Design a protein around this nucleic acid. Structure first.
Lengths: 273, 442, 442, 273
DNA sequence: ATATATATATATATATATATATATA
DNA sequence: TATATATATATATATATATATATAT
């Protein structure tokens, strides 16, 4: 079918790094419309806190409008794997930035914020060491955050999902960790870091005509004196941002790519209750 | 111990009479002069109170709306929040009087952020037009700190575009261009025939035409193939939430078209693909009419000018021409009041400056020696000369450097300047001053 | 595009480390120094902001509570309303910090009127005892406009009586008489042994006795016949709503007594007549004990001094004596800070006044001629003399009457007065000043 | 039984000029306790809004706690006359302040704010003219607002009822019209001028050490110019009254004694219906 | 008499203009 | 092509004491 509040991307459902933004509130979605690019960035507004998704039946979560639309837009379905990885093949080891890295012939490498295929790196005159599969350290292979397997077939409409919430709602209620608890039902998103969270700056300091963004108060207090004559404004939420800063934050984003720890299931029964 | 004999008629009528004064400050009918509904007037007064000191400081909308209850606004704080949010944007106003810092919405999505996040302040437009505030009428209710109405130089009631429905009455005015309104005001002021000010909507790229009095507000579009067209504008009454869900979604449900979103920084946009089921008329005019009707590109708006006039009554105007004429008359009265008070003020200022210059020029030569005497001795002595009657407290009591040679001339210069200002404000009419104020609305 | 790899543990730690900052600015534990809970601190700061211009004006409680959100109070305005309502009365406070105009309640009925009807202002008690508020510590959170704590000269945490129940901690202090607290503070200042300050509830005519640390707060009564008794006081924990509905209602339900109300302008009162079915013990001590137990006239209160130090930590004291000692130490440091800043400020003021007097003397004599010297030609001439190093901006620029004979002597008198003030501030210690500020409380 | 929030007067239930105050809110009842005359004045707080009761249905409107408590306190019972008037006897006429007034040997006359028995007036050397009952104009007698029949037997606990509401709660819903609609069930109270209303001043002007009270804004606007230097307080409710002013208004009350018109049954439908 | 509660005159830190340099589409 | 601040600079005015005075205790 279709979702009303959802704003589709031009290449949504195709092979591109299309992102879906889960804005908190219906107001920020207008800024998203104005500043996004039509090809990649999607969008969907969340009005309030999404209901808890921990220890509940799939029908119960499917009752919620927001969760149902999230599943519809993302192409995600509860209880089924988000995507199927490519079959394991020849293993190759190389030295990247002085560090030994073990990958397959069908893996993705995170270099300078961009994911590069193994075939592209091979075509880039980079030395590759063929290693037998039985003589490969799987524990070290799975510990590398910059290595992820390439997806053969995926039902996901969007490559990534970005969360974008107010900065004064992190503990006085919660909208972010509830979304994380819902997304935890597909761990493969976190294992490749699909689920992300853009960092809305906490303090925006206008140094003359330029702008400097501080993502925590401590950073600003440390850098307050070294800065020149400037004025600051506490960005207590997305609505406190102007359109130009919203564009500078969407087109040039910084992502808190969340990682699931070894016991994330136990850690989620802490704030849910 | 008194025993009055109220008869349940003076009880019931007074109870109903108190519900009247409670609904004459909530009626959604703009004052004809300042174009302000009472809530907007309270919001503007509060934002002017907060703008003391730094006029460019953005105050939280929550603070602006919370301060209106102390100014005499007896309704909720949410009303003031919404009035400020709607005033502080640019999509909804052809001439906004509140500035904005945050998400105040757009034509695509007409919802502002939470009032705690968005900041607002009185814009340069307000200070451009809204002048003579010190001469604004004092409200009859002494708890109504804002005046009866403000005094813009042009009828701001037409610029931004009002729409309100009251108990048994309703108003509807279409947003007029600032340039055309100013030209009409100048024509009315100088006595020329007034041309009907043209209607333009803020951040609107379409076209508006007038037939049978009603305004046909049409959105533009362009074709790129036999089945592909690009909708590049829609009538001002739509937003992406309702245009998609009232036109494009029904057409998709009927299988007529397939469309994708194209809304961007510039405005609206919906590229449309036409299917075989959607019949295409060979005639170009028939096809254009079918497109304009099926796709909702045509909006007809009827203007109902119901404006509270100067006397405080409800006046319904036939056309905006007579509104501009009567507004120009009453604002002419107020500009004349300002002229008279400024005459009387600048005469006293000029004579004070002349006395100061004379005192300085005399103490330079030592005519009025200040040494060897007391302050109470000098005050009475200066009170004897005719020119120093109420200025002695300001004559001996001004700084020492005035008794130099350079600063002894900057006082004569200010005396001459105040004489020139007296001449300018006492030889000119309300016509000239209203004309001069009209040439600063760029 | 940056791709950081924050883990879920960091997410949970940072989210939890904002509910540990949202419940610490709302911790119901009074500060050691000002005795203010944070909501009361915000209310006092707001009432001080409103008291600028007219300290005696009564501001609406709704306005006082609505202005606290702009000072950094992130909780509801109802909290500020209730804090002001409980703070602005005299029945609940030995030393109330807010004045009250309206119905703020009483011991009989302990609820104030609506916040829109009752007005409040900072009382003379606040200005009398809260000094050095310009040296109060600046809060670490820059959105916390009020300081870290205010600076009363006596531990106001005991005077009014606090009761805070929090998560994992609870405080309970009993209202001490202002005179006893002042005497204890003076003893701690001089270095003598501190006597235990006596507990004195406000507007309470009963008696309080200390046994095993616990306090027996007993009401009083008087007998008028063999079966007629007059309750002329009840323990401070009661109000007429709960005294009748907890003690007198069961008593009249079992047929023991019949009572009528006797309250009024003099506190509580309940004339009681007994019945035959209510046996009266012949022994005087047994009758008194059974009356005290039956009529709820005795209550036991245990003191739990949990306060927040100047370091921001939670401190628990066994007895109020050590509270007095530590408060005296920290306030002693702050009085030293005031001593030093006042020393430097009066020194600068004395130098400025001496320069002014010298300039006036020389221009009256004629040594410095201000005639025909322009403006930027006498200024640099004054800059050459050592006494006028940085004072020329204020030295030429003072009014002309200073150059007469009467005010020439008046300037030297102020120079000598400022020199004497500097000598005074550089001769006394914290002991002398903290003492002198202590005799101006009554 | 016993009403909890009711403050019983010492003389309540006797043949004394008692009064009950239906104060709006529970806060002002404390001021009433502080300032009331313990012998005569009673009290009861009204902590709510419009009490309806014009829809009748005695059982349905007895569900309301405030109405039931008022009935218990005042001694009023719905559907039964509040009191039984004295039997008609000999009629007398006298010239009162130059006005011919026809009374009967057992009425009461309102003179200078006080109600005096017919026998007392006869004993006060006042000329009385005996007139046959058949020759007495009943239409003239009914129109006399200064004459009320003496009560033979009364079940009322209080001799009067004094309403006491806020000035800010007028027009925007109130209890004064609602209490009037409830009290209309016993028109005999209004015929004798029993149900009253304490006039709270709208503006209290402090002329130095003295005070002048203005019960309408127009009165102050007309009289402010002749007043000396003064400061005024807008008394928008009973909560804004200090205890001294509350006592000055309780011990020296001004009463808007409600009188039912010829069509009271019809005038209560246009407001409540 | 005893503060004390008001009226009243004073230096001083803003709010308001007062001049005028600084630069983005 | 204008812009826009913008930085000292005046200013006059709304303050926070200091103190004269009629006053209740």
């Amino acid at each position: 079918a279709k979702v009303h509040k959802h704003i589709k991307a031009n290449l949504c459902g195709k092979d591109a790094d299309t992102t879906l933004f889960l804005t908190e509130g219906d107001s920020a979605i207008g800024y998203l419309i104005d500043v996004r690019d039509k090809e990649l960035h999607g969008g969907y507004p969340l009005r309030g806190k999404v209901l808890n998704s921990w220890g509940m039946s799939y029908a119960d979560m499917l009752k919620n409008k927001e969760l149902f639309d999230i599943c519809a837009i993302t192409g995600l379905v509860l209880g089924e794997k988000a995507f199927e990885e490519k079959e394991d093949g020849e293993w190759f080891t190389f030295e990247l930035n002085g560090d030994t890295i073990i990958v397959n012939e069908n893996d993705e490498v995170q270099i300078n914020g961009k994911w590069i295929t193994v075939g592209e790196l091979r075509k880039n005159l980079m030395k590759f060491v063929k290693i037998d599969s039985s003589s490969v350290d799987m524990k070290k292979y799975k510990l590398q955050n910059n290595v992820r397997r390439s997806i053969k077939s995926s039902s996901m409409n969007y490559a990534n999902v970005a969360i974008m919430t107010d900065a004064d709602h992190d503990g006085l209620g919660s909208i972010y960790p509830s979304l994380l608890g819902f997304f935890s039902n597909w761990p493969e998103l976190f294992e490749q870091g699909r689920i992300r969270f853009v960092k809305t700056p906490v303090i925006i300091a206008q140094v003359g005509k330029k702008q400097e963004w501080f993502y925590t108060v401590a950073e600003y207090e440390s850098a307050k004196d070294a800065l020149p004559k400037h004025s600051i404004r506490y960005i207590k939420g997305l609505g406190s941002l102007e359109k130009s800063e919203y564009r500078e934050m969407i087109q040039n984003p910084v992502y808190d790519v969340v990682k699931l720890p070894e016991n994330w299931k136990e850690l989620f029964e802490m704030l849910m209750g | 111990m008194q025993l009055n004999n109220r008869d349940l008629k003076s009880i019931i009528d007074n109870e109903a009479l108190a519900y009247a004064m409670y609904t004459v400050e909530n009626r959604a009918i703009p004052n004809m002069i300042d174009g302000f509904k009472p809530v907007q007037r309270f919001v503007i007064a509060r934002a002017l109170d907060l703008a003391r000191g730094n006029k460019d400081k953005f105050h939280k909308l929550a603070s602006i709306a919370g301060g209106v209850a102390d100014l005499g606004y007896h309704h909720g704080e949410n009303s003031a929040q919404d009035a400020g949010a709607l005033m502080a944007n640019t999509w909804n106003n052809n001439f906004p009087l509140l500035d904005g810092q945050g998400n105040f919405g757009s034509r695509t999505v007409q919802k502002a952020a939470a009032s705690r996040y968005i900041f607002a302040r009185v814009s340069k437009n307000f200070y451009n037009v809204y002048k003579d505030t010190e001469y604004a009428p004092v409200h009859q209710d002494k708890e109504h700190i804002p005046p009866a109405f403000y005094l813009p130089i042009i009828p701001t009631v037409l610029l931004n575009g009002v729409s309100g429905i009251a108990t048994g009455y309703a108003t509807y005015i279409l947003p007029h261009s600032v340039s055309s309104v100013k030209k009409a005001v100048l024509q009315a002021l100088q006595g020329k025939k007034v041309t009907k000010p043209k209607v333009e909507f803020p951040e609107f790229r379409g076209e508006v035409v007038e037939i049978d009095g009603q305004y046909e507000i049409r959105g533009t579009y362009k074709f790129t193939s036999r089945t592909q067209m690009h909708i590049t504008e829609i009538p001002y009454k739509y937003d992406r939430e309702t245009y998609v869900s009232k036109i494009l979604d029904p057409l998709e449900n009927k299988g007529f078209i397939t469309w994708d979103d194209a809304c961007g920084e510039h405005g609206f946009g919906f590229k449309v693909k036409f299917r075989k089921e959607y019949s295409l008329s060979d005639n170009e005019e028939e096809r254009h009419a079918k497109i304009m009707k099926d796709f909702g590109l045509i909006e007809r708006r009827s203007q109902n000018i119901t404006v509270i006039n100067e006397k405080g009554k409800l006046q319904v105007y036939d056309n905006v021409v007579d509104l501009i004429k009567d507004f120009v008359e009453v604002r002419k009265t107020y500009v004349q009041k300002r002229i008279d008070n400024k005459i009387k003020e600048t005469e006293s200022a000029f004579r004070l400056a002349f006395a100061k210059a004379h005192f300085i020029k005399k103490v330079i030569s030592g005519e009025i020696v200040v040494q060897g005497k007391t302050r109470k001795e000098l005050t009475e002595e200066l009170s004897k000369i005719d020119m120093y009657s109420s200025y002695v407290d300001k004559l001996v009591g001004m700084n020492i450097f005035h008794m130099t040679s350079d600063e002894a001339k900057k006082l004569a210069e200010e005396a001459k300047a105040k004489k020139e200002e007296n001449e300018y404000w006492k030889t000119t009419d309300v016509v000239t001053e209203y004309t001069k104020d009209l040439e600063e609305i760029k």
